[PDB]
Amino acid sequence: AGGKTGQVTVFWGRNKAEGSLREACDSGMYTMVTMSFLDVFGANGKYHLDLSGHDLSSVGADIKHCQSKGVPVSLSIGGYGTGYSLPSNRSALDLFDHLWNSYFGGSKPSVPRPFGDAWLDGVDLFLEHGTPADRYDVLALELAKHNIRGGPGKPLHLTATVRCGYPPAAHVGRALATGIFERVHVRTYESDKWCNQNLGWEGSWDKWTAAYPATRFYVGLTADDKSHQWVHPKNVYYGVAPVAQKKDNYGGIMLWDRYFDKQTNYSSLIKYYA
């Protein structure tokens, strides 16, 4: 069986009123912060990062500070918008090159460093939209080459953030079939009538965890205490955490998002259940 891991991953970047990345790391509530979202990418060489009006000029130093406190920072690509796709092998390698040389260890004069010499700790795939011809598998395999655990380089935590329902859409399945995703965060706070904390999340959790035994699974919860799919912290202690942790490959809790968590202090108790 699994058990508590103490791991809490939070999303950041969706609301400029949520405070800085530094503030989130300095809270001590999180073991990973995932910036969101690289919302434009595809086959025409155009890329865009959307951090919702947050002050970009502070982000690089804040990433380095988070890391200095032992909190890794990853970047999530995709989101709920319609501005991204990955329709070819070449487009996936071009996206790898953009991520590597913009945000990680690569330096090319022709690739801007939006956050200077800060070097991120992972990539998350939040692929709400896609088609079966997308090649996120190619991207995943290229990122996995740089996940160094001991030696020159540093870890790269490759993750996906997926809808509650199993099985996922084909573009996601194609990526996960590479077998090298470190973590998957299963969103259980959405309004999918048959798959959310109010109805059906556990049966889906059983299918997800069984399908990918080498991957660590995080239960995704909302920190918005007004959401229809919010879980009272007591029901995380009694229900969600003990159930999820029966799986050998339980990894932790994922929280959507820093803005809600800053308002409600959900993680102040959740960090003890994860």
Binding site: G200, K226, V231, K234, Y238
Partner: protein
């Protein structure tokens, strides 16, 4: 002093706690349960995942232990809980057919209530059925059976044990003007008028460190009583920080509502709470009374 003896002397039915087999086997904890609390709620052992882990295959060991402890100790029991979306086995939420769910839910209630017939003071028949904005939580029960799941559940429990008081229980019923509280009151009033056998509303009263003021508790509880329901209870009280003045506000919310039968605090020692880091109970991590305990004793003495 004994919390239960004092509250009964003050004209109430009980002062209660939660427990279960492991905690009742702990000799420090058990001595406090014995001396202080007249009613016990099973913390987990009567939830559906414990009682009916696969369809028609019931498991009774933990629940039987708690009921037998209470019988032996001349204590009463709040059975907890028959219909709830949380700690529900996945086989139940996988049911796709209304009529199948009606059979499954009726059977679950009939067997559980029937087994303990004549041994249960209150049943939390349905639990946490409302969203914060006053709509029904979209659980498998509501999604397949609609609002009628409530009436079916209460009717089933009543037939299986006519002597148990049947409660609807929920949290965040701590402010009279809050949407959820108003919905609970509205619906219970309507269901009473329709002949649904609801005897009580249970208000859990889980006070966080950023909650409604405990000054609102009296009015909230009275608003639940004012539905015409026969009784109300505070069922799972715990309070971040356990300030005496907050605990007294809740004590007095009960004392000043004629229909409130009692208070249950949700455990004995802080260390065994779901919220231990918030020190929310009446005894500390070495099972010693805290300031709020002494304040309650002074108030009833």
């Amino acid at each position: 002093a004994s919390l239960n003896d004092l509250f009964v002397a003050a004209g109430k039915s009980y002062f209660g706690t939660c427990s279960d087999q492991a905690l009742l086997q702990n000799s420090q904890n058990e001595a406090i349960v014995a001396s202080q609390f007249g009613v016990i709620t099973p913390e987990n052992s009567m939830k559906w995942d414990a009682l009916e882990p696969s369809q028609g295959n019931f498991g009774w060991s933990g629940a039987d232990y708690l009921v037998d402890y209470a019988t032996q100790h001349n204590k009463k029991v709040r059975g907890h809980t028959l219909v709830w979306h949380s700690q529900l086995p996945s086989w139940v939420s996988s049911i796709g057919d209304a009529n199948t769910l009606r059979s499954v839910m009726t059977n679950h209630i009939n067997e559980v209530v029937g087994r303990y017939k004549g041994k249960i003071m209150h049943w939390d028949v349905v639990n946490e059925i409302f969203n914060e904005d006053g709509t029904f939580r979209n659980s498998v029960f509501y999604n397949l059976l609609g609002e009628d799941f409530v009436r079916i559940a209460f009717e089933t429990a009543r037939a299986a044990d006519p002597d148990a008081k049947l409660y609807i229980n929920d949290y965040n019923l701590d402010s009279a003007s809050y949407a959820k509280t108003q919905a609970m009151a509205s619906y219970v009033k309507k269901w009473l008028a329709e002949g649904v056998p609801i005897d009580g509303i249970g208000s859990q009263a889980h006070y966080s460190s950023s909650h409604w003021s405990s000054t609102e508790a009296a009015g909230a509880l009275s608003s639940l009583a004012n539905t015409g329901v026969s009784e109300v209870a505070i069922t799972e009280l715990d309070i971040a920080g356990a300030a005496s003045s907050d605990y007294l506000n809740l004590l007095n919310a009960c004392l000043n509502e004629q229909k409130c039968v009692g208070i249950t605090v949700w455990g004995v020692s802080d260390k065994d709470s779901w919220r231990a880091s918030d020190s929310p109970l009446l005894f500390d991590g070495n099972y010693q009374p805290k300031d709020a305990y002494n304040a309650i004793v002074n108030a009833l003495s």
